[PDB]
Design a protein around this ligand. Structure first.
Ligand SMILES: CC(C)(CO)[C@@H](O)C(=O)OP(=O)(O)OC[C@H]1O[C@@H](n2cnc3c(N)ncnc32)[C@H](O)[C@@H]1O
Ligand SMILES: CC(C)(CO)[C@@H](O)C(=O)OP(=O)(O)OC[C@H]1O[C@@H](n2cnc3c(N)ncnc32)[C@H](O)[C@@H]1O
Lengths: 287, 286
């Protein structure tokens, strides 16, 4: 028997088998299953993905909420990760979402870490520098969510651009039959990319943090003058801010391969303000 | 959808073609059965085909692909037997409707990029001296499963460690497919059928009966305990001319981090000249 599903209401399932059964039953009834993977503690950045999924005609939106231990580091603080279950579900209800998948760690990893996904070399670069096992954790849990839910489309934010690219690699490499949809980064009024981490910044740091987005947008417009001008413009803006320790500032092609001297690319930056690591990236057209 | 002639063998090399045909079939109620092979088909493979064909309303897809990723350099990939024409003739005689024969470029357009990392079992037994072998096997099987999306996938008990690792892959990645293990097909004297038996000269072929004789002796000696079972197999293997044992181990059936307790699997690997043969058998202790 298929678990109960009440249309127009937020239906919450914790068991993988239950959401798999409902999802399959719904796809047979004329719905297109949209999957929005998250780790909860939802904000407007996450809701933008929700809205993108909801607009697809015939959509039934599945939002997964699961703090994935595998992507935290030997030094990542899993226990400290924000958990606001009640408020998250309230936001999903307000958004018209019909399915929330909230599994336990034991349900996702009943046999602990055994078979896992090993990403390509891109996983060791950029964010993979300080967190070399992070993306293996992300790809492993995303592959599982994709097999459990079997969505028609899965949504990821351009906020985590390297994550998005690695998911496209996972999908191509494993011949997965799902469409990956990237959603533009939601930003605060001054341009700061929305993140739960922004609240950790003190006033001086919050003002200095504007430099990441301002450096990227400056570079995007300086790009008519070439790659080097775009990079130098971005560095100049970051250099005008106090207490911003840049970990990297790199211009790559859109698939994160070598910096192009012409055409489309992506400029990515990561920096530390006190103990808070912030990231941002932007589309760049060279020339 | 590419052309599909029911009741005849349809051969597709493009992943997209077999994926489209499989999907269309599943949408019309047929249940898709997948039998992965590396070709050089013999009766062992045909038992998997027949197991698949007996499932009601089934359409059988046999993949034939000598997967480069599961070979370690050293001429092994080039030395693997290839008998394309006989393989397809056999599939036709069995009434198989789909043969999926992809190219290396279609399967690995980006070389080795995202891959499957198996659990610890992959570093043991067959994996001990071939550390990347099972990552190669699990990566290609995961791809084949995503391309064909079968309701059930068939594997022989002959490669028992491989079968166990595939069950781990399916459970660990929440794959919606049933894994069916098929009993080992043997020659009249007990020799497990293998595409590698063709490399045994007459003398070696005669001596090779020792692996199955040792295992079956052990299975019956086991009423007297594990030590009795293992010593009986060792005696048979030691009486065999020209058989060099690589390993002979008795494990819990999951081959996992669990001690042997009642139901086990006895596995053996041995070399006759340059030919490495494997065999295994279910064992019940006491
Ligand atoms: C994929 C996960 C769920 C795997 O555990 C995990 O790695 C994860 O990323 O979770 P999480 O941090 O919860 O983010 C979930 C999704 O929301 C997107 N997102 C976050 N802030 C955003 C913003 N300001 N604008 C647009 N999109 C934004 C992320 O890029 C990601 O696709
Ligand atoms: C899974 C593959 C296709 C991935 O490349 C590859 O690793 C592979 O295993 O190829 P291959 O050697 O072609 O074996 C294909 C399948 O037939 C089974 N098989 C072989 N000899 C058998 C016998 N005598 N009785 C019963 N089943 C037998 C194997 O265990 C395996 O599942």
């Amino acid at each position: 028997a298929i678990p109960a599903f009440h249309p127009g209401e937020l239906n919450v399932y914790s068991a993988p088998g239950d959401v798999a059964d409902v999802s399959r039953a719904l796809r047979l009834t004329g719905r297109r299953v949209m999957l929005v993977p998250t780790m909860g503690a939802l904000h407007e950045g996450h809701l933008a993905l929700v809205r993108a999924a909801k607009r697809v005609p015939g959509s039934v939106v599945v939002v997964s909420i699961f703090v994935n231990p595998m992507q935290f580091g030997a030094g990542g603080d899993l226990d400290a990760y924000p958990r606001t279950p009640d408020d998250d579900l309230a936001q999903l209800r307000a958004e018209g979402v019909e399915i929330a998948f909230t599994p336990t760690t034991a349900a996702m990893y009943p046999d602990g870490l055994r078979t896992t996904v090993q990403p390509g070399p891109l996983a060791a670069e950029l964010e993979g520098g300080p967190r070399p096992t992070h993306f293996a954790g992300v790809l492993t849990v995303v592959l599982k969510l994709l097999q459990i839910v079997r969505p028609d489309r899965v949504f990821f934010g351009e906020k985590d651009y390297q994550q998005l690219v690695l998911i496209r690699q996972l999908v191509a490499d494993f011949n997965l039959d799902v469409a990956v949809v990237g959603v533009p980064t939601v930003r605060e009024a001054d341009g700061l990319a929305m993140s739960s981490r922004n609240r950790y910044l003190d006033p001086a740091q919050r003002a200095a943090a504007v430099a990441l987005s301002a450096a990227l947008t400056a570079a995007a417009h300086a790009a008519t003058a070439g790659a080097q001008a775009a990079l130098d413009a971005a560095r100049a803006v970051l250099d005008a801010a106090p207490g911003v320790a840049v970990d990297y500032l790199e211009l790559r092609d859109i698939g994160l391969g070598p910096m192009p001297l012409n055409g489309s690319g992506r400029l990515l930056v990561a920096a530390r303000l006190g103990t808070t690591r912030l990231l941002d990236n932007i589309a760049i057209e060279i020339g």
